[PDB]
């Protein structure tokens, strides 16, 4: 299962000037491209090394798609102002996300496409990819307009054929990086609180993909601290799970780690 | 590649 996903953001800038259009492309958990119009030379650029040698024809197409979106979104921002009876005074945010997922057979599983205005759901392409639903009741005009002009058909074709054709082109392009599994380098650490208490921390570090599960047992559900999965900065990810353990009786707590790159799910305990 | 066409809301 792989996914080609894209994140588009346009923010209106009263006083500052034209709005800010940012496009962020992802192959699974890897960012590979970006377009930012805040820059004076706005072009779709590589953000992964397996894109560093691609050719003008590609960058040209992608800059145009992004440029033409920025153009529409700039208008959409003034249209959305009218729907919501808003003024030229405030800065508002239009967000568009689209993506396709592969099945286990390497064939199209699902496709999604949505719009949001000011962080709240706006319009959504249905699971069938044949119509649009106004999630917000202000999105009702956009919904009739887009269903009546048969817009979904353009997206159904992208999500079902283009997105998938390309997801494979990219997956091959960076086989050595993307498909390679980096399993987490684990270790448990001991940080004493008081004479009575002590904190036992399980560390999952340098893992790709970002999907992981970290659990403490004796099942010990009752008050375990778990931090959000964070990026290391080099492409890999980090995660830790902590539990309040009574002094001396440390070994009574076991850490369970489950990641894709691991043949056997690893279980840990602290070594003094 | 990103979607070549968007929506005019």
């Amino acid at each position: 299962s792989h996914s080609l996903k894209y994140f588009h953001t346009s923010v209106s800038r009263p006083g500052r000037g034209e709005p800010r259009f940012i496009s962020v492309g992802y192959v699974d958990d890897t960012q590979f491209v970006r377009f930012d119009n805040d820059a004076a030379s706005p072009r779709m650029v590589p953000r992964a090394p397996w894109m560093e040698q691609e050719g003008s024809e590609y960058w040209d197409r992608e800059t145009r798609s992004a440029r033409d979106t920025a153009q529409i979104f700039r208008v959409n921002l003034r249209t959305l102002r009218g729907y919501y009876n808003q003024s030229e005074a405030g800065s508002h945010t239009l967000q568009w996300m689209h993506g396709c997922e592969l099945g286990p057979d390497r064939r199209f599983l699902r496709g999604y496409e949505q719009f949001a205005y000011d962080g709240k759901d706006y319009l959504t392409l249905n699971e069938d990819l044949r119509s649009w639903t106004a999630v917000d009741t202000a999105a009702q005009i956009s919904e009739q307009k887009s269903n009546d002009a048969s817009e979904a058909e353009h997206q159904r074709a992208y999500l079902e054929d283009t997105c998938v054709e390309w997801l494979h082109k990219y997956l091959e392009k960076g086989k050595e990086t993307l498909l390679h599994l980096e399993p987490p380098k684990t270790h448990v650490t001991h940080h004493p609180i008081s004479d009575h208490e002590a904190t036992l921390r399980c560390w999952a570090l340098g893992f790709y993909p970002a999907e992981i599960t970290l659990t403490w047992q004796q099942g010990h559900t009752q008050d375990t601290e778990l931090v959000e999965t964070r990026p290391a900065g080099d492409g890999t990810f980090q995660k830790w799970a902590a539990v309040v353990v009574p002094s001396g009786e440390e070994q009574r707590y076991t850490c369970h780690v489950q990641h894709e790159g691991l043949p056997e799910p690893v279980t840990l305990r602290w070594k003094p | 590649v990103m979607a070549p066409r968007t929506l005019v809301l």
Partner: T-cell receptor, first 111, second 115 residues
Framework: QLNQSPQSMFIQEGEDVSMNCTSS?????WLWYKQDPGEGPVLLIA?????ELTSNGRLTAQFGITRKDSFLNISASIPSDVGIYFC?????????????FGKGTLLTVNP | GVTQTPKHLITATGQRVTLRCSPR?????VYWYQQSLDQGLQFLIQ???????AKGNILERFSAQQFPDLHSELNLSSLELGDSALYFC???????????????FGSGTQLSVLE
């Protein structure tokens, strides 16, 4: 790229007429325009959904389940239907407001 | 409405000419086409909310622009004999309208390039 057929049509008054349109690539919306000599093309019929048929007076257009063809029919010809009939379309996958035109079909009605 | 000026134009070979278009009020898009003696509507250039959107093989000597007030200008120079045709301006893209992509033309500019 579109292809209109026949290039020219010589019909007798009262006779019905059909006009063909074909794309090399898959299309998603079809537009039919009439152009009276020296004047700007004027919209006759818009088609948005596959197999849909929509009429405007004696004029009737069809979408074509193929997504690559569209037809225009003039029911009873009156001599005023003289002119060029242009076929325009929204190519599937084309960015917003991209729409190709045909090279037109010349209609001649004999009173 | 789609208003075009001048309705007619006669000039000499080598000279420059400027064609104006005022789109339908609310419409954000401007298209320039040229219809020759037999030829259909051969497309030149397209604008969207002041910016260029599409180019369709303009002669380099052909030049265009859309102003913040969505009016447009089609500059043609140095003029050559074969550039004699009807220049049509098309308007669309009003987000207010349900069928935005529906194109509206004006009664063109007839350009006669004479020696």
């Amino acid at each position: 790229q579109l292809n209109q057929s026949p290039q020219s049509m010589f019909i007798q008054e009262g006779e019905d007429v059909s006009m063909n349109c074909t794309s090399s690539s898959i299309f998603n919306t079809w537009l039919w325009y009439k152009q009276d000599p020296g004047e700007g093309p004027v919209l006759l019929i818009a088609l948005y959904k596959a197999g849909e048929l929509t009429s405007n007076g004696r004029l009737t257009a069809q979408f074509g389940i193929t997504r690559k063809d569209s037809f225009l029919n003039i029911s009873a010809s009156i001599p005023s239907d003289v002119g060029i009939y242009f076929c325009a379309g929204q190519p599937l996958g084309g960015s917003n407001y991209k729409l190709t035109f045909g090279k037109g079909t010349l209609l001649t009605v004999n009173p | 409405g789609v208003t075009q000026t001048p309705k007619h134009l006669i000039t000499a070979t080598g000279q420059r000419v400027t064609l104006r278009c005022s789109p339908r009020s609310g419409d954000l898009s401007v298209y320039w086409y040229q219809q020759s003696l037999d030829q259909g509507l051969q497309f030149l250039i397209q604008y969207y909310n002041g910016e260029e959107r599409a180019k369709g093989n303009i002669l380099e000597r052909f030049s265009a622009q859309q102003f913040p007030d969505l009016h447009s200008e089609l500059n043609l120079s140095s003029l050559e004999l074969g550039d004699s045709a009807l220049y049509f301006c098309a308007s669309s893209a009003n987000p207010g309208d349900s069928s935005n992509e529906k194109l509206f033309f004006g009664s063109g500019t007839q350009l006669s390039v004479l020696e």
